Amino acid sequence: VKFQVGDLVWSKVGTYPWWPCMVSSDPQLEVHTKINTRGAREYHVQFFSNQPERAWVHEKRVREYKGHKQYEELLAEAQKIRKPRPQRERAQWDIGIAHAEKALKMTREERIEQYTFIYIDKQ
Numbered sequence: 075v076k077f078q079v080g081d082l083v084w085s086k087v088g089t090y091p092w093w094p095c096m097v098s099s100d101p102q103l104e105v106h107t108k109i110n111t112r113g114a115r116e117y118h119v120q121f122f123s124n125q126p127e128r129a130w131v132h133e134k135r136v137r138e139y140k141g142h143k144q145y146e147e148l149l150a151e152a153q154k155i156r157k158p159r160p161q162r163e164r165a166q167w168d169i170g171i172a173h174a175e176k177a178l179k180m181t182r183e184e185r186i187e188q189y190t191f192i193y194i195d196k197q
């Protein structure tokens with residue numbers, strides 16, 4: 075384990091770009107980290123966005139979030155070739171970054187209080 079609840083991280087999931095997240099405890103498993111069915115470590119994250127969502131992410135797809143300007147360094151990990159940025163997606167990413175920049179100014183306990191999602195079971 076390298077991340078704990080309330081840590082700010084970037085996650086690279088599915089078809090999405092590196093995205094600002096907060097590590098959190100899964101509402102059902104009550105753990106923020108686990109070993110998956112392939113034997114690899116995963117972390118439970120919340121995506122910062124206008125659309126609240128969560129996911130289990132392979133440790134190789136998680137990075138410490140030091141600030142929004144780190145995005146360039148993450149693209150460097152992979153003429154220069156750049157993927158274009160789709161409009162709706164860029165708008166949600168900018169919202170997520172604005173929240174992550176606000177969260178970076180808080181303590182870990184403050185972030186946990188401000189951002190941990192409330193989960194409501196389908197009735």
Ligand SMILES: Cn1cnc(-c2ccccc2)c1-c1ccncc1
Nearest residue numbers: 087090093121123125126127128166
């Ligand atoms: C970056 N990202 C990777 N997966 C998701 C996602 C997960 C489950 C359902 C839907 C999307 C998102 C995302 C989440 C919220 N806002 C923007 C992107």
